[PDB]
């Protein structure tokens, strides 16, 4: 299903990222999401978000210019930046250097999303 | 309808080979009527005749030289044929300006 | 090789693709003009 | 890994080209191995059901019919132009050349109904990084 | 098979006793030139017996 | 010309991977390997064990018709030498 | 052209389309005026009457 | 011209220089007459009796 | 243009003959030199920047040396006589549309599939004779095929009076109906024309054509209208452009392979042939073989071009300078 | 499976046409296999009665 | 000709399945395998 | 064949500014 998977040679090889498509937006989907899990219990996602190790990269936010030159992000959104951090690791799911290169790069976008969410939260309450 | 190979034009517009009617398949035969003949499985030649280097295969150095020139010559040969077992299962209708 | 389905009695030329009938003539359109038989 | 499971096959030594090795007896030491064979259309869908476009299925599905060790012959370093063949094997100069051609390659893209599957494995170059990082707890 | 939806075959199972992707050289085929030589020399033996 | 493999992974594109395969199809059937023999030399050794005798590999030829007054009958005495050693390996 | 006939227009547009176009690609949308739409009307009225 | 020659099947031949195929007719046949003779050995003309 | 070679070709322009290496003074002269032992032939030509010799021909290794006139390098412009088929109708019928289609077969490409179709049409009326038809159709084609808006010259069309029967009265898009004043017209000649030419970028080529006729109803059966016979050619395109495009090619064997690629940085090789003059061509095609086991031959050829003044004076004097010096029998043309 | 129960027979190597095998020494690796035998009329109804 | 196998399950009708058998009829004459000897060569052996 | 070892190579030396190279050559090595 081509989203973050290498379906080749009779098997189903993934690199950890869960590309979440074809459900609908939180307003447009009748089940208010795809509801991937029961953990809170309604874990809701939409057509743009990606997940790596139960961490959701949002598709509705944007990238600040302060947090772009720092952390060296490439995408215009945090989801579209985590869709660009795994482009090397898409064709090579079992490479040991690429799994180390992915998890080290996935913590940066995880750090940068918490920095941008904190700046958006602090500015609106002020 | 090809105007490169068919060169005689017809007086009623267009080329004269396009006014030819041909019924290639008539009825059921229980075998291929028209098939392509081919020897021992397709067999083909890919010779090479090169001097101190080969531009074709990208090779410098020749331990066994063909000639002493700075060249490379490719040779390709193939044997081939077509068969019609029953030519009465095919009916043609040809314009006569193509001359038999 | 040119069908003419109708016949029209009129003192003037009705149409190319009909046959014009005057009193004692039958004119039909051929060779860019009206030729009568007989 | 074919069809999800590991498989093992012996490779026909007339149908494997081992390039760029260093007088090494081991085949693992090579840089570039090309494996040509004539696979059935059923065996290519057993292996590549997962990566073959619907256009590529119509390539398999538009094949004329069937035919069925004379695949096709190449001669490099030819001294001369004079080749002799009408039965299907190529006869050459008496001592300058091979003097006869026993198939040396798998040139035709389809023999019998069997397709031709050329597999190329090669070692390319990948830029990586070596990073010297200190342990947080001790000075390692 | 469990992983391939595409690995199927028919009831017919068998094997060719060949060598390196060739047509098989059987045991009868490797003894057939010697059985043809036996019949020709048992022919000359039988026409020497008769005369 | 084999394409440059000293590239970043973004410049190993769809056409670059396709250009590596069009090279292996077109150019290489070279069979120039330092430690292994030529494909017509191995195939003769296989054809001797299927009982096919190439008359161009025991003389200079001066036929192609399958009859003995100008060809040579083969007597397969090398097969039984080799079928002991592939028979012992199966019983090890 | 001096005088418009569809024998000229159907053979300007068949020789062009047979030599340059495929089968399903022979749709010709002709841009004209008001007096040309009636002139296109009168020639095919002479053709369909044929 | 290439896609014309792709609709035709293939057949591997064992080299050689020529191929023959055998065509067959019908076993049933009507045979013409040369002449009929009566009992006394003379022929039957056209202007004769029964 | 770009031509094919038997492994090399080199051209030397023979503008003047000096017969000695000390008299080579101006640009473009030639001296065919050979020694008394008839084994080596070479041509010392005075280039625009010094004396340059040729490849030393070994005269036991020549293959053919034949010299060609300039009337054999002129592409004859073919003609087509468009007439009424008199078995169909002697006079034009007063109702039908008389349309003639010209089928051009190489319009902007090289292939017969790059076609072009141009037309002319007459609505024939009552009392219109054949000469009033050919007067009214040659204007109906000249508005199409010889107009001032067209990209390229396609054909040159003409009319022929039956009293003259040899000279053509040319019709152009600007020619009015009162200019063609003759009651004895009998045919319409459509002739090929000379296409443009650029030195080295656009070669000399021609666009061929066939006049084809559309069906008219005579009696009740749709018959063909015309007949088109190939009249022998009268106009020939000269030899000026095929030799300038040949010299511009063959100067690159002895010189720069690029011609103007990158223009702050070109080497202006001066070209000596005039594209407004007709030239004779002589080719000496030879090879090389060494006295060893390398017995394969390396074919070479040398093209000598010289100006024609109508009686082939410069080339037959050049041939006589080669035959006495080298001992070959190049045939005087 | 014939008669509801599984059977196993040997295939006569003159009565089988193995199509589209891929230089395989096996018979299951074929894309198409034709079995042509002559059957008794009891065996064509022991097999296809239903 | 062997009919199209790249079909949906609905267009594999009774006349389609009858076409594959009538193709296969009279195909037992020839030989079609690269690793089998001919039937005229094995009948000599039996 | 004859046993001939052939070898071939290309080369070239560029002097960019020959105004920065000075030479005094004896007069017997000229003309």
Phi (first) and psi of residue I121, to 5 degrees:
-145, 140
DSSP state of E44: H
Instruction: Check if the beta carbon of residue I188 is closer than 8 Å to that of residue I131.
Output: no
CA dihedral I239, I243, I244, I250 (to 10 degrees): 170
Question: Two tokens at A71?
Answer: 């952390």
Closest chain I C-alpha to C31 CA, distance in angstroms: 6
User: What contacts H7, CB < 8 A, 6 or more positions away?
Assistant: D64
Residues of B in contact with G11 (CB under 8 A): 13
Residues of B in contact with F2 (CB under 8 A): 58
Helix (H, G, I), strand (E, B) or coil at D19: strand
d(CA F49, CA F75) in angstroms, rounded, equals: 10
d(CA A93, CA I179) in angstroms, rounded, equals: 86
Closest chain H C-alpha to B88 CA, distance in angstroms: 12
Question: Two tokens at K43?
Answer: 């009948």
Relative to beta strand H10-13, strand B34-39 is parallel
DSSP output for D86-136: SSSS-B--TTTS-SB----B--SSBSSS-EEEEEEEE-------------S
Question: Two tokens at I23?
Answer: 């008299």
- Is E22 in Cβ contact with D4 (below 8 Å)? no
Residue of I nearest to C2 (CA): I220
Which residues are H7's β-sheet partners?
none
Helix (H, G, I), strand (E, B) or coil at K34: coil
Instruction: Check if the beta carbon of residue I131 is closer than 8 Å to that of residue I186.
Output: yes
Residues of L in contact with I293 (CB under 8 A): 1-2
In 3D space, the residue among I267, I202, I261, I204 whose CA is nearest the CA of residue I236 turns out to be: I204
DSSP state of I155: E
Instruction: Check if the beta carbon of residue D96 is closer than 8 Å to that of residue D119.
Output: no
Question: Which of I112, I117, I210, I223 should be substituted to probe chain B, the one whose Cβ sees the most B Cβ atoms within 10 Å?
Answer: I112
Residues of D in contact with B72 (CB under 8 A): none
User: What contacts L4, CB < 8 A, 6 or more positions away?
Assistant: B65, B68
Other CB atoms within 10 A of residue F77 CB:
7
Which residues are B71's β-sheet partners?
none
Distance of CA H20 to the CA centre of its chain: 18
Burial of F61 (0-12, 13-18, 19+ CB in 10 A): middle
d(CA A54, CA A37) in angstroms, rounded, equals: 10
Does the beta carbon of I87 lie under 8 angstroms from any beta carbon of chain L?
Answer: no
Residue spans of beta strands (DSSP E) within K1-46:
none
d(CA A57, CA A81) in angstroms, rounded, equals: 9
Residues of K in contact with B31 (CB under 8 A): 26
Which residues are B54's β-sheet partners?
B59
User: What contacts E41, CB < 8 A, 6 or more positions away?
Assistant: none
Phi (first) and psi of residue I166, to 5 degrees:
-130, -40
Burial B4-26 (b: 16+ CB within 10 A, else e): eebeebbeebbbbbeeeeeeeee
d(CA E6, CA A9) in angstroms, rounded, equals: 12
DSSP state of B45: B
Helix (H, G, I), strand (E, B) or coil at A13: strand
d(CA I203, CA I275) in angstroms, rounded, equals: 12
Other CB atoms within 10 A of residue G15 CB:
19
- Is F51 in Cβ contact with E23 (below 8 Å)? no
DSSP output for chain F: -PPP--S-GGGS-HHHHHHHHHHHHHT------SSS--HHHHHHHHHTTTT---GGGTS-----SS-GGGS------SHHHHHHHHHHHHH-
Residues of C in contact with I96 (CB under 8 A): 32
Q: Determine which helix (DSSP H) or strand (DSSP E) holds G11, and give its type and residue range.
A: helix G6-20
d(CA J35, CA E14) in angstroms, rounded, equals: 14
Question: Which of D72, D87, D101 should be substituted to probe chain H, the one whose Cβ sees the most H Cβ atoms within 10 Å?
Answer: D87
- Is K31 in Cβ contact with D61 (below 8 Å)? no
Residues of B in contact with I101 (CB under 8 A): 13
Residue reference for tokens 């547009």: G13
Helix (H, G, I), strand (E, B) or coil at I61: helix
- Is K45 in Cβ contact with E18 (below 8 Å)? no
Helix (H, G, I), strand (E, B) or coil at A43: strand
Instruction: Check if the beta carbon of residue I213 is closer than 8 Å to that of residue I224.
Output: yes
Other CB atoms within 10 A of residue K27 CB:
17
d(CA I131, CA A21) in angstroms, rounded, equals: 79
- Is B65 in Cβ contact with L4 (below 8 Å)? yes
Angle, in degrees to the nearest 10, between helices D41-48 and D54-61: 170
Residues of I in contact with G1 (CB under 8 A): 121
- Is D46 in Cβ contact with E4 (below 8 Å)? yes
- Is K34 in Cβ contact with B41 (below 8 Å)? yes
Do chains G and I meet with 3 or more Cβ pairs nearer than 8 Å? yes
d(CA B94, CA B17) in angstroms, rounded, equals: 8
d(CA A19, CA A85) in angstroms, rounded, equals: 13
Question: Which residues 21-60 of D have a C-beta within 8 angstroms of H?
Answer: none
Q: Please calculate the CA angle D41-D43-D45 and round it to the nearest 5 degrees.
A: 75
d(CA E48, CA E27) in angstroms, rounded, equals: 32
Could you tell me where the DSSP H helices lie in chain I?
130-145, 240-250, 313-326
User: Which of E22, E23, E26 is closest, CB to CB, to K45?
Assistant: E26
Q: Determine which helix (DSSP H) or strand (DSSP E) holds J46, and give its type and residue range.
A: helix J43-47
**CA atoms within a 13 Å half-sphere pointing along the CA-CB vector of E38:** 5
Residue of I nearest to C4 (CA): I220
d(CA K25, CA K28) in angstroms, rounded, equals: 7
- The phi-psi region of residue K3 (left if phi > 0; otherwise alpha if psi is between -120 and 50; otherwise beta) is beta
Angle, in degrees to the nearest 10, between helices A96-125 and A78-85: 170
Burial of I32 (0-12, 13-18, 19+ CB in 10 A): buried
d(CA C29, CA C17) in angstroms, rounded, equals: 7
d(CA A54, CA A106) in angstroms, rounded, equals: 12
d(CA A99, CA A92) in angstroms, rounded, equals: 9
User: Which of D62, D64, D87 is closest, CB to CB, to H8?
Assistant: D64
Could you tell me where the DSSP H helices lie in B1-98?
none
d(CA B49, CA D75) in angstroms, rounded, equals: 9
Closest chain G C-alpha to B90 CA, distance in angstroms: 27
Instruction: Check if the beta carbon of residue D124 is closer than 8 Å to that of residue D50.
Output: no
Instruction: Check if the beta carbon of residue I7 is closer than 8 Å to that of residue I296.
Output: no
Closest chain B C-alpha to K20 CA, distance in angstroms: 13
d(CA I212, CA I205) in angstroms, rounded, equals: 23
Question: Two tokens at I77?
Answer: 């412009």
Breaks in chain D after residues (C–N exceeding 2.5 Å): 68
Residues of D in contact with B43 (CB under 8 A): 70-73, 88, 103
d(CA A93, CA A17) in angstroms, rounded, equals: 10
User: What contacts D138, CB < 8 A, 6 or more positions away?
Assistant: none
Residues of H in contact with B32 (CB under 8 A): 8-9, 11
Other CB atoms within 10 A of residue B65 CB:
16
DSSP output for chain B: --TTT--PBPTTSSBSGGG-EEE---S--SS-SEEEEEESSS-BB-EEEESSEETTTTEE--SS-S-SSS-EEEE--B--EEEES-GGG-EEE--GGG--
d(CA I124, CA G25) in angstroms, rounded, equals: 35
d(CA A36, CA A18) in angstroms, rounded, equals: 10
Instruction: Check if the beta carbon of residue I319 is closer than 8 Å to that of residue I282.
Output: yes
User: Which of D12, D14, D46 is closest, CB to CB, to E6?
Assistant: D46
Other CB atoms within 10 A of residue B95 CB:
15
Does the beta carbon of I209 lie under 8 angstroms from any beta carbon of chain B?
Answer: no
Could you tell me where the DSSP H helices lie in chain H?
none
Distance of CA I8 to the CA centre of its chain: 24
Residue of B nearest to I111 (CA): B4
User: What contacts B6, CB < 8 A, 6 or more positions away?
Assistant: B15, B16, B17, B18
Closest chain G C-alpha to C15 CA, distance in angstroms: 10
Question: Two tokens at C11?
Answer: 């003192």
Closest chain L C-alpha to I49 CA, distance in angstroms: 22
User: What contacts F89, CB < 8 A, 6 or more positions away?
Assistant: none
Residues of K in contact with J17 (CB under 8 A): 27-28, 30-32
- Is F27 in Cβ contact with B46 (below 8 Å)? no
Does the beta carbon of D112 lie under 8 angstroms from any beta carbon of chain J?
Answer: yes
Q: Determine which helix (DSSP H) or strand (DSSP E) holds I160, and give its type and residue range.
A: strand I155-161
- Is G3 in Cβ contact with I214 (below 8 Å)? no
Burial L11-24 (b: 16+ CB within 10 A, else e): eeeeeeeeeeeeee
d(CA D98, CA F31) in angstroms, rounded, equals: 15
Touching subunits for chain A (3+ Cβ pairs under 8 A): D, E
Question: Two tokens at I255?
Answer: 């010189």
d(CA F58, CA F72) in angstroms, rounded, equals: 11
Closest chain D C-alpha to F19 CA, distance in angstroms: 12
Residue of G nearest to B2 (CA): G19
Closest chain A C-alpha to E29 CA, distance in angstroms: 41
Tell whether the torsion through CA atoms of I293, I295, I298 and I302 is positive or negative: positive
User: What contacts I103, CB < 8 A, 6 or more positions away?
Assistant: B9, G15, I115, I117, I209, I210, I211, I212
Residue of C nearest to I217 (CA): C31
**CA atoms within a 13 Å half-sphere pointing along the CA-CB vector of H9:** 17
Helix (H, G, I), strand (E, B) or coil at G4: coil
- Is F24 in Cβ contact with D125 (below 8 Å)? no
- Is K45 in Cβ contact with E16 (below 8 Å)? no
Residue reference for tokens 């390229």: I152
Beta-carbon pairs below 8 A across chains D and E: 24
User: Which of I105, I296, I298 is closest, CB to CB, to B3?
Assistant: I105
Tell how many helices (H) and how many strands (E) occur in chain E.
1, 0
The Cα-based distances of D120 to B58, F39, F76 in angstroms read 18, 19, 37
What radius of gyration, in Å, describes the C-alpha atoms of chain F? 23
Longest dimension (CA), chain D: 81
Q: Please calculate the CA angle D82-D84-D88 and round it to the nearest 5 degrees.
A: 145
d(CA A77, CA A47) in angstroms, rounded, equals: 13
Residue of I nearest to G12 (CA): I117
- Is D86 in Cβ contact with H7 (below 8 Å)? no
Question: Two tokens at B97?
Answer: 């300006």
User: What contacts J13, CB < 8 A, 6 or more positions away?
Assistant: K42
- Is F27 in Cβ contact with B56 (below 8 Å)? yes
Longest dimension (CA), chain C: 27
Question: At how many Å resolution was this determined?
Answer: 3.6
Residue of B nearest to I210 (CA): B9
What radius of gyration, in Å, describes the C-alpha atoms of chain E? 23
d(CA E1, CA B56) in angstroms, rounded, equals: 46
Question: Two tokens at D134?
Answer: 């200190």
User: Which of H12, H21, H23 is closest, CB to CB, to B38?
Assistant: H12
Q: Determine which helix (DSSP H) or strand (DSSP E) holds I218, and give its type and residue range.
A: strand I216-218
């Amino acid at each position: 299903a081509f989203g973050g998977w290498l379906n080749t040679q009779g098997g189903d090889f993934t690199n950890g990222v869960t590309f979440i498509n074809e459900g609908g937006s939180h307003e447009e989907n009748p089940y208010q999401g795809i509801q991937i899990g029961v953990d809170g219990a309604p874990n809701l996602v939409e057509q743009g978000e990606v997940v790596y190790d139960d961490y959701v990269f949002s598709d509705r936010m944007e990238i600040p210019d302060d947090i772009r030159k720092e952390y060296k992000l490439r995408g215009k959104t945090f989801a579209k930046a985590a869709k660009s951090a795994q482009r090397e690791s898409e064709e090579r799911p079992n490479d040991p250097l690429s799994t180390k290169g992915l998890q080290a790069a996935m913590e940066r976008i995880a750090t940068a999303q918490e920095e941008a969410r904190q700046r958006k939260e602090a500015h609106r309450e002020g | 309808d090809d105007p490169v190979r068919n060169k005689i034009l017809h007086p009623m517009g267009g080329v004269a080979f396009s006014y030819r009617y041909d019924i290639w398949y008539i009825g059921t035969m229980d075998q291929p009527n028209i098939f392509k003949c081919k020897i021992k499985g397709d067999n083909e030649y890919r010779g090479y005749q090169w001097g101190i280097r080969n531009p074709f295969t990208g090779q410098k150095g020749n331990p066994y030289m063909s000639f002493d020139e700075d060249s490379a010559v490719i040779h390709r040969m193939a044997t081939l044929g077509v068969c019609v077992l029953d030519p009465t299962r095919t009916m043609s209708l040809i314009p006569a300006i193509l001359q038999g | 090789m040119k069908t003419l389905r109708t016949l029209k009695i009129s003192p003037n030329a009705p149409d190319i693709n009909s046959v014009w009938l005057y009193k004692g003539t039958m004119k039909y359109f051929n060779n860019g003009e009206w030729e009568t038989i007989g | 890994i074919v069809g999800g499971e590991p498989v093992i096959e012996r490779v026909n030594p007339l149908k494997i080209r081992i390039f760029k090795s260093g007088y090494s007896n081991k085949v693992e030491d090579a840089d570039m191995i090309i494996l040509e064979d004539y696979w059935s259309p059923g065996r290519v869908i057993d292996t590549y059901y997962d990566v073959l476009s619907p256009k590529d299925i119509k390539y398999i599905e538009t094949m004329p019919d069937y035919i069925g060790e004379r695949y096709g012959f190449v001669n490099q370093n030819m001294i001369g132009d004079e080749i002799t063949v009408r039965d299907g094997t190529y006869f050459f100069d008496p001592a300058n050349l091979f003097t006869e051609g026993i198939a040396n390659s798998l040139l035709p893209y389809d023999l019998a109904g069997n397709l031709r599957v050329l597999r190329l494995y090669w070692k390319s170059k990948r830029k990586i990084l070596k990073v010297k990082s200190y342990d947080p707890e001790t000075g390692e | 098979r469990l992983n391939n939806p595409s690995r199927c075959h028919f009831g017919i199972v068998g094997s060719i006793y060949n060598l390196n992707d060739s047509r098989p050289f059987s045991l009868v085929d490797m003894m057939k030139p010697y059985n043809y030589l036996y019949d020709a020399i048992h022919d000359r033996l039988n026409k020497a017996i008769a005369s | 010309n084999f394409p440059r493999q000293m590239l970043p992974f973004s410049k190993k594109t769809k056409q670059w991977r396709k250009d590596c395969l069009l090279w292996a199809n077109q150019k290489t059937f070279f069979n120039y390997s330092l430690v292994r023999k030529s494909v017509i030399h191995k195939k003769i050794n296989y054809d001797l064990l299927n009982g096919r005798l190439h008359m161009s590999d025991l003389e200079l030829v001066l036929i192609k018709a399958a009859y003995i007054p100008d060809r040579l009958q083969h007597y397969p005495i090398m097969n039984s030498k080799l079928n002991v050693l592939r028979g012992e390996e199966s019983k090890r | 052209y001096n005088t418009f006939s569809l024998k000229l227009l159907e053979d300007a547009l068949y020789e062009l389309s047979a030599s340059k176009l495929a089968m399903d690609d022979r749709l010709f949308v002709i841009k004209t005026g008001e007096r040309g739409a009636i002139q296109f009307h009168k020639e095919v009225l002479k053709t369909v009457s044929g | 011209l290439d896609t014309f020659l792709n609709s035709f099947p293939t057949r591997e031949f064992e080299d050689d220089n020529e191929y023959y195929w055998d065509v067959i007719g019908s076993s049933r046949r009507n045979i013409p007459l040369v002449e009929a003779r009566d009992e006394n050995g003379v022929v039957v003309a056209a202007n004769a009796a029964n | 243009m770009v031509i094919s070679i038997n492994q090399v070709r080199q051209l030397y322009v023979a503008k003047a003959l000096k017969a000695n290496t000390a008299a080579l003074t101006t640009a473009g002269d030639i001296v065919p030199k050979a020694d008394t032992a008839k084994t080596t032939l070479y041509f010392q030509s005075m280039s625009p920047a010094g004396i340059v010799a040729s490849d030393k021909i070994n005269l036991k290794h020549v293959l053919y040396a034949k010299a060609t006139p300039s009337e054999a390098l002129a592409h004859k412009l073919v003609r087509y006589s468009v007439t009424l088929d008199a078995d169909v109708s002697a006079t034009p019928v007063a109702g039908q549309n008389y349309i003639l289609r010209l089928a051009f077969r190489q319009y902007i490409g090289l292939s017969e599939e790059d076609q072009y179709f141009k037309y002319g049409e007459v609505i024939a009326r009552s009392g219109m004779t054949a000469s009033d038809f050919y007067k009214k159709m040659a204007i109906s084609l000249a508005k199409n095929l010889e107009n001032k808006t067209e990209s390229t010259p396609l054909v040159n069309i003409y009319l022929i009076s039956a009293a003259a029967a040899s000279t053509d009265v040319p019709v152009t898009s600007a020619t009015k109906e009162s200019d063609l004043t003759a009651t004895d017209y009998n045919q319409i000649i459509i002739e090929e024309t000379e296409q443009p030419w650029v030195l080295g970028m656009m070669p000399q080529a021609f666009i061929p054509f066939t006049p084809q006729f559309l069906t008219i109803t005579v009696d009740g059966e749709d018959r063909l209208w015309g007949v088109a016979t190939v009249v022998t050619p009268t106009k020939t395109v000269p030899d000026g452009h095929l030799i300038a495009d040949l010299e511009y090619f063959c100067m690159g064997a002895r010189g720069d392979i690029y011609r103007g690629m990158g223009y702050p940085n070109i080497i202006k090789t001066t070209y000596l042939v005039d594209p407004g003059a007709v030239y004779d061509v002589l080719d000496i095609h030879y090879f090389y073989t060494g006295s060893n086991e390398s017995v394969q031959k390396s074919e070479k050829t040398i093209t000598l071009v010289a100006v024609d003044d109508g009686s082939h004076t410069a080339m037959n004097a050049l041939i006589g300078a080669i035959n006495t010096a080298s001992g070959l029998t190049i045939a005087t043309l």
